[PDB]
Structures are given as structure tokens and as C-alpha cells.
């Protein structure tokens, strides 16, 4: 249109006129230039298959577990074994409460769910949220042979684990995030960690945390640095693809999917800093995917998916990093003439190797194409240029950090007001405390099962280990990402008064809308009555 | 070779039904390229190449058939 | 019969696949075979993802096991000793009583870790035959961690070869198969996990309100952040069938409309719920100045040969007509999408022209035959939904839009462009290409819906950097914060104007009668055949 | 120091009137264009009127409920931060400056 | 017959009285609803026992009044247009049209 001919406008009254082989082109507004090409298009054949057996035939063969109490609760939060197809059937809204096959909510069900809610205030409106897997089937076998005398069911174990998950997530939400004191402690710990070992996250350089991806200290109304409520990472909005910032909890892709793990960067030994996923789904350092040539970003405005995983040639792989020397991951090469040394991106960062993104913005760096104008200049400790100081100390720092990780992997933790309660794990996973054991015990009593407190403790330990296995990612798909967290007592007080007034407002609003529903049913009856009278008044 | 493959096949023929199903299971788990294994799950047949099977899974199957035949 | 051995040392067996896949038998025999694992069993090929996980866990707990490539470095901070403040203020103080925040009886011990790992290793022989192995296969023809190892995808009952590798979590992608629940859209590896999840997701419907329900088809107008998890799951499934759906995590804005094939199963004497099998979707932005009414669309391969793609585009355009706004799909487009939109714009323009013809022939006898009408781009756009650029680009493919060679611009009264229908037969066949198709068409009365009236938030629960009134309101209300008002207060009293009308049929009748009453053109001004190309 | 207290409450302050105005205008549209003589017309009209009425009532109800839960969790977190500060005062010796 | 007319039209009259009373109910109820902000911010009664919660306006119309820095008198009144809940039904819009 606008690229085709300007002698025609939309509202232009064009006269309609009608009396009483074709191979298609291909437009594209690319780099300001249209395209032209005959009709050649994807012809790949699709393939699927309707499997001949469902999980119906794969159901268990025997039900050896006799839940003789709250069986109604089980069967009503699980499944064990013109009227409906007319315009009269309304459009289900997002608030359609299930009144569907054989629900028949009884007083027994109501008493059961109220008992479940009274088990702990956290379990009001409870919902089984975890599905036991293959490895858990065996642990349930071992339990129900050791403690519960062949009477605990799979649904019982699922509900136990889900109560654990719910209670733990309530504690998680209400965990205080930061005060001035603990924030000072964290920043001092980070300053020490950097000044001793080195940091590939930008932390520690100053009390003002720097950008993780681009190592910058710029922050304006369009490129303002964000902070993550999962870890001490700070990334420019453009330099990290933060297209929007929710009001409370901002979690990086790692802190959102691999909730807190020190997951592996396929092109680096180090596992701290900013991360994105790949088209395959392994967390790759963003600084890596930037500086590695055959790695490229797909959606420059989101920077989200990393691509080029299989496009790297084995030369880069079999290259060696003179910093960490781990025989894995990819490695960039120096730009010095007659040089062939290699090293990981974050390795160079941590060791303080001379790096320069050039005059190319990070967009132009992830642009997937390096032009002769683009020069992503990284050097060696003997190839660094003038103005930059030799990084022998940086080599020492990186070697210290990584040999420290190694001596940690070899070392063991060598073991009344005083109370050294340990509730985490070296993987930052939870440890279900004694109150959680009591809660599970209450649940087992609720279901009427042989209930060894030692069995409760065993289930809690098993849940902690299940989370350590899953690797930070929650056992279930539960999320209330409202950030109570870093708020302050006074802010909570303002919000409570604000919510009081808003509760009054919403109460009168529900009054109005109840009147609205009543009047609407009235008007329905009005139309019905109008028909019921006019049918005979007009037509005998 | 620490296994006699002909007598191993003899013991395989001696194994009962569920023992055969378990052999199938372990082989489908530990199928590597150096082995030549084929499995028609749709119709349900299973063929293994003993000569390509490595000594590891061979001795494992040998222990299995010893346990399930004696 | 049940077993045989050839002389080449190949053992032919026969077993029942159902008994082979039965979960209880499978896990029992897995614990049986569990110890028989020869730790020196070769791994000269695809290293098991489950074994990678369990070895990661082993080297995490520092149980020395290096039978495979190597252990991984980042596992902890060196200061896990009694110096971490978290050991003296457990759970941020959320628990008060000592008898309730103590954990001496639950901090897992070495023996308990060994027990857990033992169950794990007894499961290893059960997982590969549960998740990684398929229930059916047909692989027709003509290190391994950098790219995917995903090989199938199971929705409601089918398997699917994924056209493109999606960014699932490694936990899921390094598997071979992956089940994805049709309703919940949760993605789990083990068919056992899927069995339990199918036992639990009794909410047989997708979330979000329902804005269209004809026969078996139905739409669900799932909002963008009333349920953000479901939408992230849907996006991660969609990346397996779109080449350029990169906006698959931060989906607060996108108002995902989701098509579904409702099914009424009462096979069991108890269950009769409407199983709402997810079929296709089209993510549409919530506020876009660039006039996009469909950002990213797909129907699933398992549901092709049913025209649901064309139906879903037709529904997007019905929605745009209802909004009385002009929109086109996002310009960076699928090469296949480019051709399907060529076809759809052609068919829509042909349909609009056919409506014009039938109306003019309703007015055939009373209106003089030599009198020709003058329709416009906007006249077509208010009828279809596509922007006028789209209408001309979908008319040129129909080859009914002719122009004049020379420009006698001295007199502005002269016609520049014309619409010259070559053959009503040609156009009726171009349109009848759908009649023989018998595709699901958008019965424009069933839609119950209204525009997405934004406040100051624009729908998102946060703030993003991106008509002009709100686009400036966003940037003005943006102001720095570390870790003039009252929009929409009048949208109810926008009826007092007649310029914009409510219903699509009203807009259609309005523009149609407006053009019928537009001044006619005699057949004599330009009857020169050569001058029109 | 503080923040715009509306930003934490975007849901009930903004998206409650958004959907409310929307469904109200929608009911208005249907009733205004309820062709009086049309039998299935008025049938669908009355049915969807009742529908959207239930919808708006349930929307304001659900927002009431979510604000109740938010009040409860807010005061809980208030007492929890009380706990946290009261405790963390003591460990100043161990925790660095 | 005529008896059917009597019974149906008396049902209709009663339901019409109920419907008009519900109309008036919503009318005066939103009247009080939008005057509550004026009697809640300037002279705070409900949203504040004493003058402490300076943000006591209204959900729908009040966006800045829910900010303590709002010290002006902009949202003290309203109009019959802003009365959204009444406008919902079409009968009320037609009556307002006749009365306009
Ligand atoms: Zn940056
Ligand atoms: Zn993070
Ligand atoms: Zn890296
Ligand atoms: Zn290194
Ligand atoms: Zn060099
Ligand atoms: Zn589900």
C-alpha cells in the first residue's frame, strides 16, 4: 500500500465497476527493502500418532490401602472408580464453581474440609497440588511396609506432601526479605567475596551494585537497573530483556524456573550471575551467549531464547581455558595476532581480563550478526592493551575461587539460650521443621492411620530430599508471588488501613452489585411476563 | 568372555514370562548404540544381539538368569 | 510361541505391551533389577538424563561417585558452618516456639540420604521405560546435551513430533518424551506423573471466561495475568509448533484466546463432564498501537484437516470487528502464515465483494443499471476487519483492482483507481473454494464479549516501556522508585455518540447503506477497456 | 521512602473497575439491543443478563475475598517482621557491620 | 381469556413495582455511595474514625484521592453520567432519555 502506491487513500471513493500461471511473490519490510521471490514454501510432512493404550489400562491392579476415614474427602478431591447441550447452558465464566459429575457436596464433605482447614490456618481452601512420581512409589512402599502397616494410600501420601508444600510456601512468602541490617551484611559479604575470589556478576565492585550482564552503572527512566528478589543480581532493562517489571517480586528466569539452584552454564564452569534459557532449555550465561560468536539471541527486545547451541564447531569445545582448565563448556578466543588461547567468558570476567563490547550496544552484540564494524575485543593477560593492568592477580583470584569450590567438594562440615537451628541445605533448599512434623502427624490422625511420629519425621526428611533432588524448583506448581517480603512494618500498617477502607468500599460495591443481580433477574422476569401477556393479548 | 552366550540363551528360554518381560525392561533401559536391539512395542516382540551386547550387561543378564533359574 | 533364538545369537521374544507398561508391575520389577545394575555398564551413546540428575545429586551430597564424565563445581557457599545468621534466626522468625522451630529430629542424616538414593537407583530402571520410551512409534526415514533429546509430545491421547525444540526446563527437555496435560498444561516427564495428574485435574475446563460456544467448538478468553502459570505453560507448548514465538514467559499482557473441542463423555455411569480438549490458540496483545489483533497463532497438528486455523483467524477478525478497530496480524510472519493469510485475505475480500454484489442486486431493478457505485478501502475494512493496507494487499491477489495508465491530474474529478470485477463466475468460484471445504465459520451472534477497557495499568500488574493519550499516560506516570488520574471513568457514557456503534451487524448495515446512498457513477465516464489494467 | 500505595493494589483499584465497567457496558449493550419481539433473541438476552450479573457479583465477591486474604497475610507478616527485628537485634555481634 | 389477562397483568404490575423499587434502590444507594467519599475524606466518618486515613475516596471514580498527597477538592461531586450501575439496564437509559 504505502510502499506500493500513494495515489490512493483509504477513504478515497473508488468507483465500483462491474458490467451487466500465477506464481506468488513475497513482501517483507526488511532493512527498508521489500522482497520478491516465486512461490516456494515449507512442504515438510507432519507426523503424530493416536496411542493405542491410555493410562486407563496402566492404572494399578490392586487397591491395597483402606482409607477408612475422610474417604469422602479423598474421592471429592480426587477420582477413584437440551439440558447439558443447549443455549440454556450458560457460558462458563472464570468463576464457574464445579457442580459437575456426581460432586453432591454433602455435610460430611463440608465437615471434612473444615477439619482440614482447622488442621492449620494455612490450609484453608486446600487443594492437592503434587503428583507422586516413580521414585516416590518405592518410598511409599517402604513407608507403608515399615510404619503405616499397609494402610496409607497414594492419595494419602500426595496430600501429606502437598500440606508440606503449602505450609512451606506460606513460610516462604512470609519470610522477611531485607532490612537495612541484613542488607548491609549481604553487601559486605559480597564485597569480601569479590575482593578475595572475584565475581562474574558485577557485585562487590561498589556498594552500589552494578549491572550483571553489561557491567555498567547507568540507570535512567528508560534503562533503569532492576534487582531480583531471588538473588543479588542487577541487570539493565535493555541489557537483559526486562520488557516489564511487576510491582513486587521480580525474579530472573533462573529464580523463576530453577528457583534458586546453582545450575550449570553449558559454556562455563561458574554458575552465578545473569541467565537465560536456550531453544533446548539449559541455563546459559547471558554474557556468554553474547560473547560466544556462534551463540546468538533470537528476540532482541526480549533476549529470552539463546540459540546456536549445536552451531558451534568442535574447535571451540576442544579449546582449553587457561583460567579454570575444566574440560567442558565453550570458550571464546583472544584477538591477539598469532594467538590461539581460549577461556570461558565468565572466567575472563572474574579474572578481570580485558574485555570490551566496543561501540556496539548490547542489542548490536546479541544482533546475531557481527559486522566488520563490530569488534568484541577480549584479550589475554599477556595480550591486554595499554591502560589495562596485567591480570596475574585476577588469574590468582579465579584459581582461588575454583580450587575453593573443589576443596569444598572434598571438605566436610566438621561437627539453654543457644540454638543453632539448621533449616536450609547447601542447595538453599528447605528443611521441614518440627512444626511441619506435627502438622503431618495431625493430617495422619485426621485420616485415621497408624501414625508414628518417627514416620512423620521420615516423610519430612523425604520431602526435603525430594526438593534437593528436583533442585530448588518447587515440588508442586504453587505460586503466590505477591511480595510481602521486603516491606516494612509501617508500610504494612498503611496498607492495612488502606485495605480496611477498600474493604468497606468493596462491601458497599457488592451491595450495589447484589441489587444489580436482583434487578437483572427482575428484568428477566419482566421480559418473560411481557411475552406471557402479549402472546394472548395480541394473538387469540 | 566371562559368559557362555549359548547356555545363556538356554537359560533365557528357561525363564518364565515375567522374567522375560524384565529382561526386555533392562535392555530397553540400557540400550546403547554399540548394541543391536529392536523392540516392536506396537505388536510386542523383542530381539537382542548377544554378540554386540557388552560384557557389562552380559554379566548382569547372567546374574539375573542365575537368580531366576536357580 | 513366546520365545525363540536364532543361531546368530538373537533372542526373539513376545510380551503383552499392557503388562509391559503397567506401573505397579514395572516398579516392582524395577526394584528387582535394581541391584543387578553393573556400574561398569557402558555409556558409549546417549547418557541418560535421569542418570545425569542422580549423579548430580550424588556429587551434591558428596557421595564420591565419578563413574561418569565429571562432577560439577558450583554446589554451595563455603560458609555453611555455624556462622550463617540463618542458623540463629530460623525461617526469618516466622515460627515462635522452640518446640516448633527446632529441627534436630528432621535434619536429614547420612543414613536417610542413603535410603533415598537407594529408592532412586531402584527407580532408575523404571524411569527410562516409563518416560523416555514410547507407547507407539513410527520413525520413517529417507555432546548430546547441547541440543535437545525431546522426541515426542503427548497431549490428550496422541503423540506428536515437535516441529521445533521449545525452551522447556532441562529437567523436561533432556528427557525423550514429555507428557503435557491438555487442561492444566503442566508438563511432566514420567507417564506415572501424568497418570496421577490426570487423576487429579478434575477441573475438566480451561480457565478464563467463555466467549463463544457453537456445537463442539468453543473459545475461552483466558486473560493474561489472572492466571500467569497456565499461560506460561501454554506458551512453552506453543514454541513446539511456532518458529518465532519467543514471547513465551513474560505473558502478563497477552489475552490468550484458546480454542477447544468440547466432548461429552458419559462412558462411566458417574462422569459426564464436558472435557474441553485444548486445540488452538492465538495470543493477542492487550494494547498495541501498531494495530495487531493476532500476535501469534497456532492450531495443533493433531487437529488439522479441520480448518481450525482459518476458523481462528476468522474469529480474530470477528473480534476486531466487534472492537470496531482496525488490526492486522503481526508483520514478522510465518512463511506458511504468509501464504495462509494471502488465501484468507483473498477470500475475505471476495466475500465482501460478493455481499456488495448481492445487496446491489437487491437494489438492481429500482436503481438504474448504468449507475455504478463507489466503495472505499474503509468501506471494506469496516466490513472485514483488516486494515486498508491489508485489504489492498489481499485484493491484488484476487486481481480485481485495476488502475489507469496516465495521470490527467488537471481535473481532480477524473477516476484514478477502479474496482473492475472481471467475472462474477471467477469471484464466486474463488469464494466457493470454502463452500466445498465445509470449514467451521464464525456464527457472529454467539460471541459474548466487549473490548478490553484498560485502566492506567493497561492490564499488566506492572509497568513496561513502549492511542497517544494512554501511551503518554504510561510514560508520565512512570517515575523512579527503588526496592492526571481516573481513566475509564466515562467508558459507560460513550453511547451518547452515534459515530461508533456497538454491534457488528449495525456497523455493517450502516456502512452498506451509506455506500448504497453514496452518489452513483454512470457506466459512460470510463468505458474504455484498454485504459484499465 | 514510601511508594504509591495504589501500585500494590492494582488488582482491586484498577482491574476491578476495569472488568466491572466492561461487564456492565456489555449487559447494557445486550439489553439495549434486545429485539423485543425476537423470542430466541430475548431468551439469549435474559440468559446472558443473568450470566453477567452472576459474573459481576462473583467478581466483586472474589475481590473481597482476595483482599481479606491479603489483610490476613499482611498482619501476619507484620507480626513476623516484629519477630524478625526483635531477634536480629541480638546477633549484631556475629553478623558483620 | 380476560381472567388470564388479569392474572398475568397483576403479576406484571407487582413485578414492575419491584423492578422500579430496585431501580430506585440502586439509584439512591449509589448516591450514598458517591457521597460517602465526600463524607469520608473531608469530614471522615467511615473510612476514618479520626482524621488519619486521608485516602477515603471511592474505588471507581477516585484514583488520586487514594494518595495522601491529594489535598485538593476535585472529586467532591459527581454527575448522573458517572452513575454506571444504574445505566446497566436499558430501561433506565430509555427513561433518562425521555427525561433528558
Ligand atoms: Zn545492562
Ligand atoms: Zn535471580
Ligand atoms: Zn557461562
Ligand atoms: Zn577458567
Ligand atoms: Zn590471547
Ligand atoms: Zn491437568
From Swiss-Prot, chain A:
It is found in: Cytoplasm; Nucleus. A zinc finger (C2HC pre-PHD-type) spans 262-295. Keywords: Cytoplasm, Metal-binding, Nucleus, Phosphoprotein, Repeat, Transcription, Transcription regulation, Zinc, Zinc-finger. The keyword Cytoplasm applies. Present with 172 molecules/cell in log phase SD medium. Component of the NuA3 histone acetyltransferase complex. The NuA3 HAT complex has 2 functionally distinct forms. NuA3a binds H3K4me3, through the PHD finger of YNG1, and acetylates H3K14 at the promoter region of actively transcribed genes to promote transcription initiation. NuA3b binds H3K36me3 at the coding regions of actively transcribed genes, through the PWWP domain of PDP3, and coordinates transcription elongation. This is NuA3 HAT complex component NTO1. The chain holds residues 18 to 603 of 748 of the full protein.
UniProtKB/Swiss-Prot annotation, chain B:
It comes from the Eukaryota. There is a cross-link at residue 7 (Glycyl lysine isopeptide (Lys-Gly) (interchain with G-Cter in ubiquitin)). It is found in: Nucleus. The 1.2 MDa TFIID complex is composed of TATA binding protein (TBP) and the 14 TBP-associated factors. One copy of each TAF1, TAF2, TAF3, TAF7, TAF8, TAF11, TAF13, two copies of each TAF4, TAF5, TAF6, TAF9, TAF10, TAF12, and three copies of TAF14. TFIIF is composed of three different subunits: TFG1/RAP74, TFG2/RAP30 and TAF14. Component of the SWI/SNF global transcription activator complex. Functions as a component of the DNA-binding general transcription factor complex TFIID, the RNA polymerase II associated general transcription factor complex TFIIF, and the chromatin-remodeling complex SWI/SNF. Binding of TFIID to a promoter (with or without TATA element) is the initial step in preinitiation complex (PIC) formation. Belongs to the TAF14 family. TAF14 is the only non-essential TAF. Present with 3100 molecules/cell in log phase SD medium. The YEATS domain specifically recognizes and binds acylated histones (acetylated and crotonylated). Binds crotonylated lysine through a non-canonical pi-pi-pi stacking mechanism. This is Transcription initiation factor TFIID subunit 14. It comes from Saccharomyces cerevisiae (strain ATCC 204508 / S288c) (Baker's yeast). The chain holds residues 175 to 244 of 244 of the full protein.
Curated annotation (Swiss-Prot), chain D:
Belongs to the ING family. Component of the NuA3 histone acetyltransferase (HAT) complex. The NuA3 HAT complex has 2 functionally distinct forms that participate in transcription. The NuA3a HAT complex is composed of at least NTO1, SAS3, TAF14, YNG1 and EAF6. The NuA3b HAT complex contains an additional subunit, PDP3. Interacts with H3K4me3 and to a lesser extent with H3K4me2. The lineage of its organism: Eukaryota, Fungi, Dikarya, Ascomycota, Saccharomycotina. It comes from the Eukaryota. This is Protein YNG1. Histone-binding component of the NuA3a histone acetyltransferase complex. Targets the NuA3a HAT complex via histone H3K4me3 to facilitate transcription initiation at promoter regions. SAS3 then acetylates H3K14, leading to transcription initiation at a subset of genes. YNG1 is required for the HAT activity of NuA3 but not for its integrity. Mediates the interaction of SAS3 with nucleosomes. The PHD-type zinc finger mediates the binding to H3K4me3. It is found in: Nucleus. It comes from Saccharomyces cerevisiae (strain ATCC 204508 / S288c). Present with 861 molecules/cell in log phase SD medium. The chain holds residues 9 to 105 of 219 of the full protein.
UniProtKB/Swiss-Prot annotation, chain E:
It comes from the Eukaryota. The keyword Transcription regulation applies. InterPro entries: Eaf6 (IPR015418). Its main location: nucleus. The keyword Acetylation does not apply. Residues 26-54 are annotated as: Disordered. GO terms for cellular component: NuA3 histone acetyltransferase complex; NuA3a histone acetyltransferase complex; NuA3b histone acetyltransferase complex; NuA4 histone acetyltransferase complex; nucleus. It is found in: Nucleus. Residues 1-33 form a coiled coil. Pfam families: NuA4. Keywords: Chromatin regulator, Coiled coil, DNA damage, DNA repair, Nucleus, Transcription, Transcription regulation. GO terms for biological process: chromatin remodeling; DNA repair; DNA-templated transcription. Present with 504 molecules/cell in log phase SD medium. Component of the NuA4 histone acetyltransferase complex composed of at least ACT1, ARP4, YAF9, VID21, SWC4, EAF3, EAF5, EAF6, EAF7, EPL1, ESA1, TRA1 and YNG2. Component of the NuA3 histone acetyltransferase (HAT) complex. The NuA3 HAT complex has 2 functionally distinct forms that participate in transcription. The NuA3b HAT complex contains an additional subunit, PDP3. Belongs to the EAF6 family. This is Chromatin modification-related protein EAF6. It comes from Saccharomyces cerevisiae (strain ATCC 204508 / S288c).
Amino acid at each position: 500500500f504505502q510502499d506500493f502506491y500513494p495515489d490512493l487513500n483509504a477513504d478515497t471513493l473508488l468507483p465500483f465497476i462491474v458490467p451487466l500461471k500465477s506464481v506468488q511473490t513475497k513482501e517483507l519490510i526488511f532493512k527498508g527493502r521489500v522482497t520478491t521471490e516465486p512461490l516456494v514454501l515449507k512442504k515438510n510432512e507432519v507426523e503424530f500418532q493416536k496411542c493405542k493404550i491410555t493410562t486407563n489400562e496402566l492404572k494399578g491392579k490392586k487397591n491395597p490401602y483402606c482409607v477408612r476415614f475422610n474417604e469422602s474427602f479423598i474421592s471429592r478431591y480426587y477420582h477413584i472408580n437440551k439440558e447439558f447441550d443447549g443455549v440454556e447452558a450458560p457460558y462458563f465464566t472464570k468463576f464457574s464453581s464445579k457442580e459437575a459429575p456426581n460432586i453432591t457436596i454433602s455435610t460430611s464433605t463440608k465437615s471434612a474440609i473444615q477439619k482440614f482447614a482447622s488442621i492449620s490456618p494455612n490450609l484453608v481452601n486446600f487443594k492437592p497440588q503434587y503428583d507422586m512420581d516413580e521414585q516416590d512409589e518405592l518410598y511409599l512402599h517402604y513407608l507403608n511396609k515399615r510404619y503405616f502397616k499397609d494402610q496409607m494410600s497414594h492419595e494419602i501420601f500426595e496430600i501429606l506432601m502437598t500440606t508440606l508444600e503449602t505450609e512451606w510456601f506460606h513460610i516462604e512468602k512470609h519470610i522477611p526479605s531485607t532490612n537495612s541490617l541484613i542488607a548491609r551484611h549481604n553487601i559486605l559479604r559480597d564485597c569480601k567475596n569479590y575482593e578475595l575470589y572475584g565475581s562474574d556478576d558485577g557485585t562487590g565492585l561498589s556498594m552500589d551494585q552494578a549491572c550483571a550482564v553489561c557491567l555498567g552503572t547507568d540507570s535512567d527512566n528508560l534503562n533503569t537497573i532492576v534487582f531480583c528478589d531471588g538473588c543479588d543480581i542487577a541487570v539493565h532493562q535493555e541489557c537483559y530483556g526486562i520488557i516489564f517489571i511487576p510491582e513486587g517480586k521480580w525474579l530472573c528466569r533462573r529464580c523463576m524456573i530453577s528457583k534458586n539452584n546453582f545450575a550449570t552454564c553449558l559454556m562455563c564452569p561458574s554458575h552465578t550471575g545473569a541467565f537465560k534459557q536456550t531453544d533446548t532449555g539449559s541455563w546459559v550465561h547471558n554474557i556468554c551467549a553474547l560473547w560466544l560468536p556462534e551463540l546468538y539471541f533470537s528476540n532482541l527486545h526480549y533476549m529470552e531464547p539463546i540459540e546456536g547451541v549445536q552451531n558451534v564447531s568442535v574447535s571451540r569445545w576442544k579449546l582449553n581455558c587457561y583460567i579454570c582448565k575444566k574440560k567442558m563448556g565453550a570458550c571464546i578466543q583472544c584477538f591477539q595476532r598469532n594467538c590461539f588461547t581460549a577461556y570461558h567468558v565468565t572466567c575472563a570476567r572474574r579474572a578481570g581480563l580485558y574485555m570490551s563490547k566496543g561501540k556496539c550496544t548490547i542489542q548490536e552484540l546479541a544482533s546475531n550478526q557481527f559486522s566488520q564494524k563490530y569488534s568484541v575485543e577480549s584479550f589475554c593477560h599477556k595480550h591486554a592493551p595499554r591502560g589495562w593492568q596485567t591480570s596475574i592477580e585476577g588469574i590468582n583470584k579465579a584459581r582461588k575461587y575454583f580450587s575453593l569450590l573443589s576443596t569444598l567438594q572434598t571438605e566436610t562440615p566438621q561437627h539453654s539460650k543457644f540454638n543453632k537451628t539448621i533449616w536450609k541445605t547447601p542447595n538453599q533448599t528447605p528443611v521441614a521443621p518440627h512444626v511441619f512434623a506435627e502438622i503431618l502427624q495431625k493430617v495422619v490422625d485426621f485420616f485415621g492411620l497408624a501414625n508414628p511420629p518417627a514416620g512423620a519425621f521420615d516423610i519430612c526428611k523425604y520431602w526435603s530430599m525430594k526438593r534437593e533432588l528436583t533442585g530448588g524448583t518447587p515440588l508442586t506448581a504453587c505460586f503466590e508471588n505477591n511480595s510481602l517480603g521486603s516491606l516494612t512494618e509501617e508500610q504494612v500498617q498503611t496498607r492495612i488501613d488502606f485495605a480496611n477502607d477498600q474493604l468497606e468500599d468493596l462491601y458497599r460495591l457488592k451491595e450495589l452489585t447484589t441489587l444489580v443481580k436482583k434487578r437483572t433477574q427482575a428484568s428477566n422476569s419482566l421480559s418473560r411476563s411481557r411475552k406471557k401477556v402479549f402472546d394472548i393479548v395480541k394473538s387469540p | 568372555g566371562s559368559v557362555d552366550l549359548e547356555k545363556l540363551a538356554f537359560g533365557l528360554t528357561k525363564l518364565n514370562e515375567d522374567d522375560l518381560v524384565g529382561v526386555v525392561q533392562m535392555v530397553t533401559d540400557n540400550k546403547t548404540p554399540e548394541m543391536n536391539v529392536t523392540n516392536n512395542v506396537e505388536e510386542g516382540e523383542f530381539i537382542i544381539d548377544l554378540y554386540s551386547l557388552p560384557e557389562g550387561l552380559l554379566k548382569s543378564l547372567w546374574d539375573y538368569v542365575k537368580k531366576n533359574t536357580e | 510361541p513366546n520365545i525363540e533364538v536364532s543361531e546368530e545369537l538373537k533372542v526373539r521374544i513376545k510380551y503383552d505391551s499392557i503388562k509391559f507398561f503397567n506401573f505397579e508391575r514395572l516398579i516392582s520389577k524395577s526394584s528387582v533389577i535394581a541391584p543387578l545394575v553393573n556400574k561398569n555398564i557402558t555409556s558409549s551413546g546417549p547418557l541418560i538424563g535421569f542418570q545425569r540428575r542422580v549423579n548430580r545429586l550424588k556429587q551434591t551430597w558428596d557421595l564420591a561417585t565419578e563413574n561418569m564424565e565429571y562432577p560439577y563445581s558450583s554446589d554451595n557457599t563455603p560458609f555453611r558452618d555455624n556462622d550463617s545468621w540463618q542458623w540463629y534466626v530460623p525461617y526469618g522468625g516466622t515460627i515462635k516456639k522452640m518446640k516448633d522451630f527446632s529441627t534436630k529430629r528432621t535434619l536429614p542424616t547420612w543414613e536417610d540420604k542413603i535410603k533415598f538414593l537407594t529408592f532412586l537407583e531402584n527407580s532408575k530402571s523404571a524411569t527410562y521405560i516409563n518416560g523416555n520410551v514410547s507407547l507407539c512409534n513410527h520413525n520413517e526415514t529417507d555432546n548430546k546435551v547441547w541440543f535437545s533429546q525431546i522426541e515426542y509430545i503427548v497431549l490428550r491421547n496422541y503423540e506428536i513430533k515437535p516441529w521445533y525444540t521449545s525452551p522447556f526446563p532441562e529437567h523436561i527437555n533432556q528427557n525423550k518424551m514429555v507428557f503435557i496435560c491438555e487442561f492444566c498444561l503442566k508438563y511432566m516427564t514420567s507417564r506415572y506423573t501424568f497418570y496421577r495428574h490426570q487423576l487429579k485435574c478434575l477441573t475438566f475446563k480451561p480457565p478464563g471466561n467463555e466467549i463463544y460456544r457453537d456445537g463442539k467448538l468453543s473459545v475461552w478468553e483466558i486473560d493474561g495475568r489472572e492466571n500467569v502459570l497456565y499461560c506460561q505453560n501454554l506458551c512453552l507448548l506453543a514454541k513446539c509448533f511456532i518458529n518465532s514465538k519467543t514471547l513465551y514467559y513474560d505473558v502478563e499482557p497477552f489475552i490468550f484466546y484458546i480454542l477447544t473441542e468440547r466432548e461429552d463423555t458419559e462412558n462411566h455411569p458417574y462422569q459426564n463432564a464436558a472435557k474441553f480438549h485444548f486445540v488452538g490458540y492465538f495470543s493477542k496483545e492487550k494494547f498495541n498501537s501498531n494495530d495487531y489483533n493476532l500476535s501469534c497463532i497456532l492450531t495443533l497438528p493433531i487437529y488439522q484437516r479441520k480448518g481450525y486455523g482459518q476458523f481462528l483467524m476468522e474469529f480474530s477478525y470477528l473480534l476486531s470487528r466487534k472492537e470496531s478497530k482496525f488490526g492486522t496480524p503481526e508483520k514478522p510472519l510465518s512463511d506458511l502464515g504468509l501464504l495462509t493469510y494471502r488465501t484468507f485475505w483473498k477470500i475475505k475480500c471476495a466475500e465482501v465483494l460478493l455481499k456488495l454484489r448481492d445487496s446491489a442486486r437487491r437494489r438492481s431493478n429500482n436503481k438504474n443499471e448504468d449507475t455504478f457505485q463507489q466503495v472505499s478501502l474503509n468501506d471494506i475494512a469496516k466490513l472485514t476487519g483488516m486494515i486498508p493496507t491489508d485489504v489492498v494487499f489481499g485484493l491484488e491477489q484476487l486481481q480485481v483492482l485495476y488502475r489507469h495508465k496516465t495521470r490527467s491530474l488537471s481535473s481532480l474529478d477524473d477516476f484514478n483507481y477502479i474496482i473492475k470485477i472481471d467475472s462474477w463466475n471467477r469471484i464466486e468460484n474463488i469464494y466457493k473454494t470454502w463452500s466445498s471445504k465445509n470449514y467451521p465459520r464464525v456464527k457472529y451472534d454467539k460471541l459474548l464479549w466487549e473490548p478490553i477497557i484498560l485502566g492506567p495499568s493497561f492490564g499488566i500488574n506492572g509497568m513496561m516501556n513502549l492511542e497517544n493519550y494512554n501511551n503518554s499516560r504510561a510514560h508520565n506516570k512512570r517515575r523512579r522508585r527503588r526496592r492526571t488520574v481516573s481513566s475509564l471513568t466515562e467508558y459507560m457514557c460513550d453511547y451518547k455518540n452515534t459515530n461508533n456503534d456497538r454491534l457488528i451487524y449495525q456497523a455493517e448495515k450502516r456502512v452498506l447503506e451509506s455506500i448504497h446512498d453514496r452518489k452513483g457513477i454512470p457506466r459512460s465516464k470510463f468505458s474504455t477497456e484498454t485504459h484499465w489494467e | 521512602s514510601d511508594s504509591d500505595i495504589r501500585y500494590s493494589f492494582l488488582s482491586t483499584l484498577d482491574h476491578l473497575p476495569c472488568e466491572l465497567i466492561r461487564s456492565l457496558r456489555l449487559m447494557q449493550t445486550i439489553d439495549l439491543f434486545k429485539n423485543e419481539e425476537d423470542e430466541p433473541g430475548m431468551e439469549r438476552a435474559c440468559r446472558d443478563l443473568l450470566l453477567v450479573a452472576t459474573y459481576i457479583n462473583d467478581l466483586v465477591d472474589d475481590q473481597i475475598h482476595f483482599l481479606k486474604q491479603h489483610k490476613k497475610e499482611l498482619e501476619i507478616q507484620k507480626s513476623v517482621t516484629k519477630n524478625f527485628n526483635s531477634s536480629l537485634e541480638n546477633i549484631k555481634s556475629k553478623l558483620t557491620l | 381469556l380476560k381472567a388470564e389477562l388479569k392474572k398475568s397483568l397483576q403479576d406484571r404490575r407487582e413485578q414492575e413495582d419491584t423492578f422500579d423499587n430496585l431501580q430506585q434502590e440502586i439509584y439512591d444507594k449509589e448516591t450514598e455511595y458517591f457521597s460517602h467519599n465526600s463524607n469520608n475524606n473531608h469530614s471522615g466518618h467511615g473510612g476514618a474514625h479520626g482524621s488519619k486515613s486521608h485516602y477515603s475516596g471511592n474505588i471507581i471514580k477516585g484514583f488520586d484521592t487514594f494518595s495522601k498527597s491529594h489535598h485538593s477538592h476535585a472529586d467532591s461531586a459527581f454527575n448522573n453520567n458517572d452513575r454506571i450501575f444504574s445505566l446497566s439496564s436499558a430501561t433506565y437509559v430509555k427513561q433518562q432519555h425521555g427525561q433528558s
